[PDB]
Amino acid sequence: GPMSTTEVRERRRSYLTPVRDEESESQRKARSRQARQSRRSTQGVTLTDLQEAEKTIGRS
């Protein structure tokens, strides 16, 4: 008869049926990675450090 794998196969492929998100997610990351790396590279900028310091937070 038919195979049961066809059920987990189609459901497993849907996880990324629309790759459109994989393209925008990879593009937005490459822009922020190279952008933040260029800013901190030239210097601290006294601006990007404020955002990173708030995200890192300091607890005990």
* CA atoms of 25 and 51, how far apart (whole Å): 21
C-alpha to C-alpha distance for 59 and 51, rounded to whole angstroms: 17
Spatial distance between the Cα atoms of 13 and 19, rounded to a whole number of angstroms: 11
Helix (H, G, I), strand (E, B) or coil at 19: coil
Q: Which domains does the chain have, with CATH numbers?
A: 1-60 (6.10.140.390)
**What is the distance, to the nearest Å, from the Cα of residue 43 to the centroid of all Cα atoms in its chain?**
25
Compute the half-sphere exposure of residue 21: CA atoms within 13 Å on the CB side of its CA.
5
CA 26 and chain centroid, separation: 7
d(CA 17, CA 15): 6
